[PDB]
C-alpha cells in the first residue's frame, strides 16, 4: 500500500484502441501506462509501434507478469499513479496472488470468439474468464463493466448472473 498506487486497471485485448486510452488517460490523470502480457512482450514489432504511439506526456511500458510483480515491489514508483493494462482477468488474479492489492477491476473490452458467451456489446467471457471474476468478487473486489467512463456502469456479476445462473 505504501508503494505504487493503481490509478485504474483496464482489461482490453487491444490495449490502446481509438481514443479510449487518450480519454481514459486524461480522466484517470495517468502519466504512466504499463502493459502486462507475455505474448505482446514477445512481439518486438508490436512493442515498437505501441511505444511510438504512446500519448504525449504519457509513457507506455511493456513487461511480463513476473517482471510486473517486481516493478511494483519497488518503492521507486511509490505514490506514482500507474494504469494497468491486461488482456485477460487470469493475469489479474495472478498479480493479486503475488500480494498485489486491487480494489476493483474495470472491463474495457474483450474480442468475441466461438465457444464464448457475449455478455456485452463487445465483451466475451469463457468458463475461465468467469471463474477468475468470481474469485476476485469473493475477495471483496468490485467488478465493473463499461466501455467508456461516459457509459452506464454495469456489474460483472449481474451480467454473468443473468447468463450463468
Amino acid at each position: 500500500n505504501d508503494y505504487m498506487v493503481i490509478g485504474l486497471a483496464r482489461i482490453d485485448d487491444r490495449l490502446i484502441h481509438g481514443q479510449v486510452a487518450t480519454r481514459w488517460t486524461k480522466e484517470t490523470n495517468v502519466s504512466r501506462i504499463i502493459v502486462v502480457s507475455d505474448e505482446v512482450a514477445a512481439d518486438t514489432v508490436r512493442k515498437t509501434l505501441l511505444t511510438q504511439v504512446a500519448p504525449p506526456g504519457v509513457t507506455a511500458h511493456v513487461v511480463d507478469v513476473a517482471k510486473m510483480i517486481r516493478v511494483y515491489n519497488n518503492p521507486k514508483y511509490a505514490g506514482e499513479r500507474v494504469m494497468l493494462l491486461f488482456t485477460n482477468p487470469t493475469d489479474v488474479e495472478r498479480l493479486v496472488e503475488g500480494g498485489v492489492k486491487i480494489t476493483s477491476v474495470n472491463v474495457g473490452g474483450m474480442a468475441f470468439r466461438q465457444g464464448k458467451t457475449q455478455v456485452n456489446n463487445a465483451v466475451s467471457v469463457d468458463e475461465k474468464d468467469i471463474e477468475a471474476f468470481k474469485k476476485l468478487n469473493a475477495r471483496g473486489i468490485e467488478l465493473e463493466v463499461r466501455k467508456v467512463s461516459t457509459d452506464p456502469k454495469l456489474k460483472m456479476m449481474d451480467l454473468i448472473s443473468k447468463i450463468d445462473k
Binding site: G18, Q19, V20, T48, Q52, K147
Partner: protein, 133 residues
C-alpha cells in the same frame, strides 16, 4: 457546451456522428444536415437554422463540414459571417470529431476548441509505412 453542427454533401454527416458516438457514447448538443442534389445554399441555410434552434448556442457554434467551397461550406459561411463565436472548419474526419467532442466537456474557450479541432484533424492524417524492427 459549445454547439457542433456537421454538414456534408449526401448523407455522411449522420454516420460520422454515429461513428463518433460508437467511440464516445451518445452526444448532446450536436446537430447535422444532409445535402441532396437539387438543393441550393438557401435550402441549406434553412436546414442549419432549424438545427440551431434546437441547440444551446450560448457559448458558440462550430460547423464541421466536408470540403472547403462546397454548398455545405458556403451555406455555413453565410451564417457565421458577423457572428462572434461561430466558425466553419472544413475537412471533418473522425480524429477531429473525437478530439473535439472530448475536449468540449472540459469547457474550453471557443478559440481553444477551434485550434484543437484543426490541429487534431490534421495530425489524424497519417500513413502506416514500414516500421522499425
Amino acid at each position: 457546451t459549445i454547439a457542433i453542427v456537421i454538414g456534408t454533401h449526401g448523407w455522411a454527416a449522420e454516420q460520422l456522428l454515429k461513428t463518433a458516438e460508437m467511440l464516445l457514447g451518445e452526444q448532446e448538443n450536436v446537430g447535422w444536415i444532409d445535402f441532396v442534389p437539387g438543393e441550393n445554399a438557401e435550402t441549406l441555410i434553412e436546414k442549419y437554422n432549424a438545427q440551431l434552434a434546437k441547440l444551446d448556442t450560448t457559448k458558440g457554434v462550430l460547423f464541421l463540414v466536408d470540403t472547403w467551397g462546397g454548398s455545405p461550406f458556403n451555406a455555413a459561411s453565410r451564417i457565421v459571417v458577423d457572428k462572434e463565436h461561430y466558425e466553419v472548419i472544413a475537412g471533418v474526419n473522425i480524429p477531429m470529431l473525437v478530439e473535439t467532442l472530448m475536449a468540449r466537456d472540459d469547457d474550453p474557450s471557443f478559440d481553444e476548441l477551434v485550434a484543437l479541432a484543426v490541429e487534431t484533424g490534421r495530425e489524424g492524417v497519417k500513413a502506416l509505412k514500414a516500421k522499425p524492427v
